[PDB]
Enzyme design. Structure first.
Site, short mmCIF file in Angstrom:
data_model
loop_
_atom_site.label_atom_id
_atom_site.label_comp_id
_atom_site.label_asym_id
_atom_site.label_seq_id
_atom_site.Cartn_x
_atom_site.Cartn_y
_atom_site.Cartn_z
N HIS B 41 42.13 33.48 43.72
CA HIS B 41 41.79 34.21 42.51
C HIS B 41 42.14 33.44 41.24
CE1 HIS B 41 45.81 36.40 42.79
NE2 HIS B 41 45.81 35.97 41.52
N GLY B 143 51.53 36.18 36.70
CA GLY B 143 51.86 34.76 36.71
C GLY B 143 52.63 34.32 37.94
N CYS B 145 51.70 34.91 41.05
CA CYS B 145 50.83 34.62 42.19
C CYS B 145 50.95 33.18 42.62
CB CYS B 145 49.39 35.02 41.92
SG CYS B 145 49.23 36.76 41.44
C1 LIG Z 1 49.83 41.53 37.63
C2 LIG Z 1 50.58 41.14 38.88
C3 LIG Z 1 51.92 41.51 39.04
C4 LIG Z 1 52.58 41.19 40.21
N1 LIG Z 1 52.00 40.55 41.23
C5 LIG Z 1 50.73 40.18 41.08
C6 LIG Z 1 49.97 40.44 39.94
N2 LIG Z 1 48.60 40.06 39.86
C7 LIG Z 1 47.59 40.61 40.59
O1 LIG Z 1 47.73 41.64 41.26
C8 LIG Z 1 46.28 39.85 40.56
C9 LIG Z 1 45.11 40.67 41.16
C10 LIG Z 1 43.78 39.97 41.30
C11 LIG Z 1 42.92 40.29 42.34
C12 LIG Z 1 41.64 39.75 42.40
C13 LIG Z 1 41.20 38.88 41.43
C14 LIG Z 1 42.06 38.55 40.42
F1 LIG Z 1 41.65 37.65 39.48
C15 LIG Z 1 43.35 39.06 40.33
#
Ligand SMILES: Cc1ccncc1NC(=O)CCc1cccc(F)c1
Ligand SMILES: Cc1ccncc1NC(=O)CCc1cccc(F)c1
Lengths: 304, 304
Positions: B41, B143, B145
Site C-alpha cells: 500500500h 507511518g 506500516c
Molecule cells: C493509520 C494507521 C495506524 C496504525 N497502523 C496502521 C495505520 N495505517 C493503515 O491502517 C493503512 C491502511 C491502508 C489500507 C489500504 C491502502 C492504504 F493506502 C492504506
C-alpha cells in the site's frame, strides 16, 4: 492507536556488552570508548559475599586477572580502578560500536529500559520504573549483574542503571554508572530494608491520559477535585502526593485531550475509592504507574 | 527472580530498517540481502485506499519511483515485484548488517517482538501475542506500516509479521513476510470483521507456572480437574480448549515445579470462577496470556 509497555530499541546498547570474568565469577560489563564498567563484586568468591572488603580483594588482582571478552574479541586490560561499587577496566581498544552516550542519575519515578544480559550476551529488553524507594522490579537471574538500564534521546544513550543485586524479597538494586547505589543498599549478601514504596501518581495520571487518547474513557466522570483533596486520597492509598510540578509536566496531555489535570485527578480519586469494578484500562486491571508523562507523549506521537 | 513482558533484543532488526517512499506515501521497509520488503500500500494515494487496484497502481510505477533510504544511504532500486500484499524491491547492494534470518508464518497464540518504526527509524520494542483471531493488539500510529515482528533463536532472526493496517476497532493486522495476511483481512480502508477472539489457555497456564517459580503461589489450591471438566469452564469463559498437545508443551514447567498440569488447570478453573479477589499475580490483576511455555522457560533459565 494502542498503548504498550515499550522499551527503547536496544541495538546501541547491545554493541557495548562484554563478559567480564575475575577468578570464578563471570558477569556483564559495559564497554564504552576504552573503558569497561562492571559491578565490583565480580572480584568476590562465596565466603567473601557477606561483608567483602573490596579494597583488599581488589589489591590481590592485577590487570591480567580481568578477562574481558566481546564474544570473539578478547580485550587487553591496561588499567583497573574501583569507583564506588563499580570497576573501571581500561582497555587498549576503544569500542568501535560506542554510541553517543551520557551517564545520568535518574530520579525515583522515572522509567528506563533494561537490556538483560548473561555472559555478555543480550537476552531481552523490557521497560520499567525506578520505584520511589529506589528498587526496581526487574527480571534478573544469577549472571545478569552488569546488565544496564538506559534511555535514548535521538542518537544519545543515557545510561542510568547497572544491575548489582537481588534483595531477599526478590526486588532489584543497582547503581548509577559511577557506582553509586540507588537507595540505601550496599553490595553485601545481607537482608536490607527497602523503604516503604508508593505508587507514582503523576505516571498513573499520564497513563489515564494515554487511555483517553486511545479510546478507553469509561473512568471519566462528572467530578473535579483540588490538590489538597486529592492528596488526602493519595495519602490513604499510598500514592505520592501530587504537586504543581507534576501538574505542570501533565500540561501537554491535558492540552491534547482538553481534560483539566484536576478533573483527571477526580477520575483517579474515584478509581482509588471504588476500584475498577471488573473493567480494564489499556488491557490492565490495575492502575499502571510505569509510564511517565514524557513516555506517553513519545508513544502517542511516534518519536524515533 | 522477577518476571517481565520481555522483548528480544532488537539490534539485529534495527540494522535492517529502511524508509520507502513512493509518491506521497512514506513507510518502513525491511532490507535483507539485496531485497527491501514493504507493504504494497506504499503505492496508494488517498482516493485509492477504499478498494485499490494494486496491479494497476503498480504498473504506473518504475524502479526509480521507489525511494529507499537507510538513513544516510540512498539505495538504488534495480527491480520491483508484488508478492501477495508485499512489495519486494531489488536493490544493487546487499545490506551489510543482514543477520542470519528466516521467514516464518507463526501460529495464533504464539508470541513475538515488534520493533515499531517511523520513517525507517526505530521508536521502540515490545512483546505481544498473535491473537487466536489473527489480530495483534499493538501500538502503531500512521507511518508505522512496514514495522516487523520477529523472534530470535541464538543468532537467527525469524521474521513473522509485517504491519499493514489498523482496523476501525483499534486492533492491528498484517502479513507474514511473503505478504499473506494473518486472518481474513485485506489491505483496503473498509470495516472488516475480526473473528471472535479467545484467551490463550496454554499461555495463561505457562504464566501461572512462571508465577509459582517466582514466589506468587496464593492461587494454588487443594483441587484437581480433568481436560473435559476444565474445557467446560474454558468454554464458559471464552478460553481456548486445552488439548494433550498443550499439556505436553507444559511438561517442562510441570517437571520443574512438581505441579501436575491438571492441578494447575484446577487453579486456573478457580481463578476463572472466582476472580482474583483484589489480589495480583506477577504484578497483574488479570490472567495474562502473552507468554508461551517456551517464553517462560527462556526467561526463567536466562537464554541468550
Ligand atoms: C493509520 C494507521 C495506524 C496504525 N497502523 C496502521 C495505520 N495505517 C493503515 O491502517 C493503512 C491502511 C491502508 C489500507 C489500504 C491502502 C492504504 F493506502 C492504506
Ligand atoms: C542471584 C542474583 C539474581 C538476580 N540479580 C542478581 C543476583 N546476584 C546478586 O544478588 C549478587 C549479590 C552479591 C553481593 C555482594 C557480593 C557478591 F559477590 C554478590
Amino acid at each position: 492507536s494502542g498503548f504498550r509497555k515499550m522499551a527503547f530499541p536496544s541495538g546501541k546498547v547491545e554493541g557495548c556488552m562484554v563478559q567480564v570474568t575475575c577468578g570464578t565469577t563471570t558477569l556483564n560489563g559495559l564497554w564504552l570508548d576504552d573503558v569497561v564498567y562492571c559491578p565490583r563484586h565480580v572480584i568476590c568468591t562465596s565466603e567473601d559475599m557477606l561483608n567483602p572488603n573490596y579494597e583488599d580483594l581488589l589489591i590481590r588482582k592485577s590487570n591480567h586477572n580481568f578477562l574481558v571478552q566481546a564474544g570473539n574479541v578478547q580485550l587487553r586490560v591496561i588499567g583497573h580502578s574501583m569507583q564506588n561499587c563499580v570497576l573501571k577496566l581500561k582497555v587498549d581498544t576503544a569500542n568501535p560500536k560506542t554510541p553517543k552516550y551520557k551517564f545520568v542519575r535518574i530520579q525515583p519515578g522515572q522509567t528506563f529500559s533494561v537490556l538483560a544480559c548473561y555472559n555478555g550476551s543480550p537476552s531481552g529488553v523490557y521497560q520499567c520504573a525506578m520505584r520511589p524507594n529506589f528498587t526496581i522490579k526487574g527480571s534478573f537471574l544469577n549472571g545478569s549483574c552488569g546488565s544496564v538500564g538506559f534511555n535514548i534521546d535521538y542518537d544519545c544513550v543515557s545510561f542510568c542503571y547497572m544491575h548489582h543485586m537481588e534483595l531477599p524479597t526478590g526486588v532489584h538494586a543497582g547503581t548509577d554508572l559511577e557506582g553509586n547505589f540507588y537507595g540505601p543498599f550496599v553490595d553485601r549478601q545481607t537482608a536490607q530494608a527497602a523503604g516503604t514504596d508508593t505508587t507514582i501518581t503523576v505516571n498513573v495520571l499520564a497513563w489515564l491520559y494515554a487511555a483517553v487518547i486511545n479510546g478507553d474513557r469509561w473512568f471519566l466522570n462528572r467530578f473535579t477535585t483540588t490538590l489538597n483533596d486529592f492528596n488526602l486520597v493519595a495519602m490513604k492509598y499510598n500514592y505520592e502526593p501530587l504537586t504543581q510540578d507534576h501538574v505542570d509536566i501533565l500540561g501537554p496531555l491535558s492540552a491534547q485531550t482538553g481534560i483539566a489535570v484536576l478533573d483527571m485527578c477526580a477520575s483517579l480519586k474515584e478509581l482509588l475509592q471504588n476500584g475498577m469494578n471488573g473493567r480494564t484500562i489499556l488491557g490492565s486491571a490495575l492502575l499502571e504507574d510505569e509510564f511517565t508523562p514524557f513516555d506517553v507523549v513519545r508513544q502517542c506521537s511516534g518519536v524515533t
